[PDB]
Design a protein around this ligand. Structure first.
Ligand code: BCL
Ligand code: BCL
Ligand code: BCL
Ligand code: BCL
Ligand SMILES: CC[C@H]1c2cc3[nH]c4c(c3C)C(=O)[C@H](C(=O)OC)c4c3nc(cc4[nH]c(cc(n2)[C@@H]1C)c(C(C)=O)c4C)[C@@H](C)[C@@H]3CCC(=O)OC/C=C(\C)CCC[C@H](C)CCC[C@H](C)CCCC(C)C
Ligand SMILES: CC[C@H]1c2cc3[nH]c4c(c3C)C(=O)[C@H](C(=O)OC)c4c3nc(cc4[nH]c(cc(n2)[C@@H]1C)c(C(C)=O)c4C)[C@@H](C)[C@@H]3CCC(=O)OC/C=C(\C)CCC[C@H](C)CCC[C@H](C)CCCC(C)C
Ligand SMILES: COC1=C(OC)C(=O)C(C/C=C(\C)CC/C=C(\C)CC/C=C(\C)CC/C=C(\C)CC/C=C(\C)CC/C=C(\C)CC/C=C(\C)CC/C=C(\C)CC/C=C(\C)CCC=C(C)C)=C(C)C1=O
Ligand SMILES: COC1=C(OC)C(=O)C(CC=C(C)C)=C(C)C1=O
Ligand SMILES: [Fe+2]
Lengths: 302, 240, 281
């Protein structure tokens, strides 16, 4: 090939990079891990350090309990038989309490209680991780974009698991913890609500999911196409526009009639992605609370 | 109907959002210009954004965009038509004049710095203790042009230290001097380095750096632009 | 008409076909031979859609729907009003998509950059041809292709999927979805990271890429780097589309049952097909 720069031809290695200091509490950084030659073909080879601290540990811990609670239930469903455990691993499911328990936390363990407990650990694990994404940025003096984007994903998960079931009056309305069972749940949700293809926030959501693949293919390919001019060094290209930024912008202007800037493409990017779950969340939230049947709602246009 | 309300509201939001993103992407390159360099009359339906300022690290100053732009370099092209929309032809040697695929931008004649204030890019012999950890080491290999003639031999690798990445080969020419080659424009083989963009006698015209241990942003543009321009302008010597 | 830095790039050369005859711009748009071809396929294709809208009796864009020939036609030509417009429009669309890509190649040449973008766009074209050509031909009728209408092609998706039960159980489909999700994840992260470095806290100077690296190492113990993340984005989005085409090319060609049935190569395996209890025993 007229070399495509998908994989490096040569790897170089030097002393581990211990990272910027700023206001990071250095007491909570690990040592550095080993270098990975395997990963070095595609990206950086350095593993670590990682930063832990209170929230990270709380998040890890709480997340492990979540995993453990589900796991122990799966073993229970497999009658403590390892062979059955592996045979039926994808069919195991931890279900929410049945409708007749409403929103009470008074369901017996084997009938939805254990689901409530898992959800509690999951809830703590995710929000404390969110706090972490926010505090890592702050300690380095960075903007909070990552935390705000993550919040968009959290929104869809909150709607599916908590906000919508509460508004519907029943935990039984939440999503089970199982590989196949949450798939069956997804199918069933659409059938019950009169075909989600005719939910317009669902169509919007799909436009941005597709749009995200579109844009990241456009942008990944654009940067590789101008890496022969050092295009991937985008911060310095923002501060001091180079021929990389200019050719990238002219490619698209000539193709399509308009173009982005090196900073501006990243604003297009962050919104394209976060709109997937922002809109999806709204669409799920409205289903069965406000609209029973999307197909029928659609035929009246509203 | 609350669903109706919601979907009409979101479309309002989305239009405001798009207008924001588009204006925000007009911080470079605008106002539009006529082909004679005067401002175009039709600037489009989106206004220029109000200025924003970046405070560059390491005392390098501030950047405000948008702001009045120059090329800050003479451009050796002649208009080929009375009307608007046709190619501008090079009046001289486009490789040397830095036009078309061989263009470069007048970036700051300073090297890029890492987070600690040190030069981001260094020759590997000056970087303790980087070494080649996988793949074919190109040091000491012959460098061959598109004319299948040897142009020199690889004497060092210039590495992006924070990223731990090879960015240039330093190549020694027959006359003893050296040149940098973008790592992206070379093909490292078992017994040689092959460079498709240039014939062996065009290596000498690769711009030179004024320090043997650092390269500036201006120099990297000049080097990269010139080598990439070879694909269009050195094609006659690209061997049948 | 021009960006402030644009003139020095608007030089002659790079065309694949026609030399300098189509080597010019209209406003911001570059033309070239494939610009002309794109226009011609698009013009004709849009006319036929109008011609078909007349046959249908509506000009409401959300009712217009051009269907392909009935199954009984198999793979033959059909009368214009009975599937023939669909056939011609498909030819045009393919002509336009392919022209669009070759125009991108001409533009790459004029600007001196790699060919990654039209290369990447070719996968989207591959995916389209999988649905309207490869799969219908392997099944032996154009009527298995999808109709060209805003809501009707959604019905087609729904109908096709439920023909094999819950289409979720298609394993290539699972893989495709995982790349679509991971790709949106990575795009959000990549966008947030660059913006958070360029637009730091108030009172702060612009951050360096070393801060970016340091942010992801602190957060998850690994930074892929600035080159690697763009490699990754390209990889994720193309792989999502590749497995999409794959999960359909095999549906109705080498697999005809409900996809949940596929998963028994695991359940009824030798060491445990019989052990009582769990979900399946
Ligand atoms: C991919 C697998 C399925 C399929 C499944 C779905 C599902 C499921 C949904 C859509 C949705 C849409 N699909 Mg579909 N779709 C397929 C194939 C296609 C093809 C094609 C030629 O292959 C096209 C052009 C479209 C086009 C569209 C849009 C009407 C809409 C938003 C997509 C989007 O933003 O994408 C990302 C691209 C962009 C963001 C860039 C802009 C693209 C613009 C918007 C395209 C407009 C097309 C235009 C109206 C028609 C041609 C114009 C000509 C001049 C006549 N689909 C196949 C058959 N598609 C959604 C919908 O109807 O929402 C209401 C939806 O829920
Ligand atoms: C029968 C099936 C139904 C249907 C039913 C649904 C339902 C029901 C839903 C969707 C949703 C979505 N559907 Mg639909 N869908 C259908 C057909 C389609 C088609 C198609 C071509 O046919 C497409 C392209 C889509 C596409 C989409 C997406 C746009 C959207 C999911 C966004 C997302 O990123 O979620 C992935 C992201 C998340 C769920 C957020 C996760 C965030 C949390 C914080 C992560 C925690 C991680 C945890 C701590 C660690 C876990 C590790 C694991 C062990 C691996 N659907 C048909 C009509 N679809 C969703 C939506 O928004 O709808 C409006 C939704 O709820
Ligand atoms: C969006 C509407 C549906 C849904 C529909 C689907 C469908 C359909 C599919 C998945 C798939 C997956 N889903 Mg699910 N999924 C939903 C909500 C969730 C939640 C959550 C926090 O609510 C979690 C943890 C998961 C987790 C997962 C993984 C088991 C798997 C790959 C995800 C991925 O690539 O992530 C990003 C990757 C990383 C973080 C790494 N889903 C909701 C309820 N999900 C796919 C799969 O393989 O299932 C077996 C699949 O085909
Ligand atoms: C009830 C329906 C079934 C089901 C049935 C199907 C069927 C049936 C199919 C899929 C396919 C897909 N499904 Mg499914 N699917 C279900 C549930 C889901 C869920 C979910 C959350 O539950 C998800 C995430 C998905 C996800 C997906 C993707 C993996 C894939 C669509 C993307 C694609 O192919 O793009 C490919 C990209 C394109 C086709 C775009 C091509 C664009 C062309 C080249 C250019 C257009 C130019 C345009 C006209 C110009 C306009 C320009 C003007 C300027 C406007 N499905 C349920 C169980 N799914 C489809 C697939 O894999 O297709 C290959 C498919 O056919
Ligand atoms: C904008 C929309 C997209 C998005 C964005 C997004 N996600 C994000 C972020 C952002 C911007 C983050 O900053 C955050 C992050 O830190 O990323 C690196 C995150 C992230 N998104 C993640 C996942 C995720 N995002 C998803 C989706 C998306 N995220 C959207 C497409 C999906 C799905 C379903 O598509 C998943 C799976 C995480 C990688 C991370 C959030 C991390 C977190 O909350 O961690 C807390 C939990 C733990 C530490 C638990 C650890 C325990 C183990 C993992 C065990 C569980 C295993 C399982 C239960 C198996 C059981 C069986 C066994 C007994 C055999
Ligand atoms: C492969 C990864 C992703 C990808 C990549 C990608 N797409 C691309 C590119 C790349 C890299 C381009 O360079 C190119 C571009 O220029 O984008 C700005 C393009 C592009 N992707 C487009 C759309 C698109 N991409 C999609 C998807 C994807 N694109 C993938 C997810 C989708 C989806 C998911 O639905 C759509 C709708 C266009 C914006 C653009 C190509 C524009 C083009 O080809 O223009 C020439 C054609 C015309 C001007 C019009 C022709 C009209 C026809 C003759 C008549 C209509 C026929 C059609 C079948 C009607 C049917 C509509 C119904 C289904 C509703
Ligand atoms: C780092 O980098 C990056 C950037 O950059 C810095 C970027 O920007 C981008 C680009 C990304 C963005 C800008 C973000 C937003 C983009 C998206 C969200 C993706 C979605 C995009 C769309 C939905 C837009 C869709 C595309 C459109 C609308 C194209 C429209 C199509 C046309 C108008 C047709 C094209 C026209 C052609 C082919 C040419 C015209 C045809 C002809 C035949 C001309 C006929 C002539 C008229 C006549 C001529 C007269 C003559 C000959 C005169 C002679 C005689 C005389 C007398 C003088 C990326 C990725 C990037 O990562
Ligand atoms: C500094 O370069 C990097 C990014 O650039 C935005 C990343 O997104 C990411 C994160 C994205 C994924 C999904 C690894 C990493 C790790 C990284 O090193
Ligand atoms: Fe980028």
């Amino acid at each position: 090939a007229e070399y495509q720069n998908i994989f490096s031809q040569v790897q170089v290695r030097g002393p581990a990079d211990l990272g910027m200091t700023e206001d990071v509490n250095l007491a909570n950084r690990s040592g550095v891990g080993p270098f990975s030659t395997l990963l070095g073909w595609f990206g950086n080879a350095q593993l670590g350090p990682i930063y832990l601290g209170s929230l990270g540990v709380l998040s890890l811990f709480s997340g492990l309990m979540w995993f453990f609670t589900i796991g122990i239930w799966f073993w229970y469903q497999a009658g403590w038989n390892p062979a059955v455990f592996l045979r039926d691993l994808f069919f195991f499911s931890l279900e929410p309490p049945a409708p007749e328990y409403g929103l009470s936390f008074a369901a017996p363990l084997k009938e939805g209680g254990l689901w409530l407990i898992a959800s509690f650990f999951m809830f703590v694990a995710v929000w404390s991780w969110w706090g972490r994404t926010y505090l890592r940025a702050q300690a380095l003096g960075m903007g909070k974009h990552t935390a705000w984007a993550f919040l968009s994903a959290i929104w869809l998960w909150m709607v599916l698991g908590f906000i919508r079931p509460i508004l519907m009056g029943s935990w039984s309305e939440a999503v089970p913890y199982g590989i196949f069972s949450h798939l069956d749940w997804t199918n069933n949700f659409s059938l019950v609500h009169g075909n989600l293809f005719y939910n317009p926030f669902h169509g919007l959501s799909i436009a941005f999911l597709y749009g995200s693949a579109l844009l990241f293919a456009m942008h990944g390919a654009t940067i590789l196409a101008v890496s022969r001019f050092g295009g991937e060094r985008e911060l310095e290209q923002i501060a001091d526009r180079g021929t990389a930024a200019e050719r990238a912008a002219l490619f698209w202007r000539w193709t399509m009639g308009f173009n982005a800037t090196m900073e501006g493409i990243h604003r297009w990017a962050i919104w394209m992605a976060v709109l997937v779950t922002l809109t999806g969340g709204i669409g799920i939230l409205l289903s069965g609370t406000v609209v029973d049947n999307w197909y029928v709602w659609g035929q009246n246009h509203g | 109907d609350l669903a109706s309300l919601a979907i009409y509201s979101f479309w309002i939001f989305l239009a405001g959002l798009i207008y924001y993103l588009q204006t925000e992407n007009m911080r470079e390159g605008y106002p539009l210009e006529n082909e004679d360099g005067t401002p175009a009359a039709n600037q489009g339906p989106f206004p220029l954004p109000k200025p924003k300022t970046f405070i560059l690290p390491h005392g390098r100053g501030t950047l405000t965009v948008p702001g009045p732009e120059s090329e800050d370099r003479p451009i050796a092209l002649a208009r080929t038509a009375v009307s608007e929309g046709f190619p501008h032809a090079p009046t001289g040697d486009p490789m040397k004049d830095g036009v078309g695929p061989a263009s470069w931008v007048a970036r700051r004649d300073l090297p890029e710095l890492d987070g600690h204030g040190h030069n981001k890019i260094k020759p590997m012999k000056a970087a303790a203790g980087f070494h080649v950890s996988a793949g074919k080491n190109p040091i000491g290999l012959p460098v061959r042009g598109c004319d299948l003639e040897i142009a020199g031999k690889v004497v060092d690798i210039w590495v992006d230290i924070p990223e731990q990445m090879a960015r240039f080969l330093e190549v020694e020419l027959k006359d003893g001097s050296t040149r940098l080659l973008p790592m992206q424009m070379v093909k490292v083989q078992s017994n040689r380095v092959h460079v498709n963009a240039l014939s062996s006698d065009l290596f000498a015209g690769i711009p030179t750096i004024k320090s043997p241990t650092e390269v500036t942003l201006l120099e990297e543009d000049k080097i990269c632009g010139y080598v990439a321009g070879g694909l269009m302008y050195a094609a006659p010597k690209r061997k049948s | 008409a021009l960006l402030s830095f644009e003139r020095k790039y608007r030089v002659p050369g790079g065309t694949l076909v026609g030399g300098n005859l189509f080597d010019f711009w209209v406003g911001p748009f570059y033309v070239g031979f494939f610009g002309v071809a794109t226009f011609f396929f698009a013009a004709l294709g849009i006319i036929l859609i109008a011609w078909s809208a007349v046959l249908q009796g509506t000009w409401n864009p959300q009712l217009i729907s051009v269907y392909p020939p009935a199954l009984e036609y198999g793979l033959g030509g059909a009368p214009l009003a009975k599937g023939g417009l669909w056939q011609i429009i498909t030819i045009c669309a393919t002509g336009a998509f392919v022209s669009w890509a070759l125009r991108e190649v001409e533009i790459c040449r004029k600007l001196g950059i790699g060919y990654h973008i039209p290369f990447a766009f070719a996968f989207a074209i591959l995916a389209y041809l999988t649905l309207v050509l490869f799969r219908p031909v392997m099944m032996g009728a154009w009527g298995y292709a999808f109709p060209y209408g805003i809501w009707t092609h959604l019905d087609w998706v729904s109908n096709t999927g439920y023909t094999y039960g819950n289409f979720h159980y298609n394993p290539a489909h699972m893989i495709a979805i995982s790349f679509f999700f991971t790709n949106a994840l990575a795009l959000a992260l990549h966008g947030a990271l660059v913006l958070s470095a360029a637009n730091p806290e108030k009172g702060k100077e612009m951050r360096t890429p070393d801060h970016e690296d340091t942010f992801f190492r602190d957060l998850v113990g690994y930074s892929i780097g600035t080159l690697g993340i763009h490699r990754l984005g390209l990889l994720l989005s193309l792989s999502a589309v590749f497995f999409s085409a794959l999960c359909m090319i095999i549906t109705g060609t080498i697999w005809f049952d409900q996809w949940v049935d596929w998963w028994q190569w695991w359940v009824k395996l030798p060491w445990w097909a019989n052990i009582p209890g769990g979900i399946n025993g």
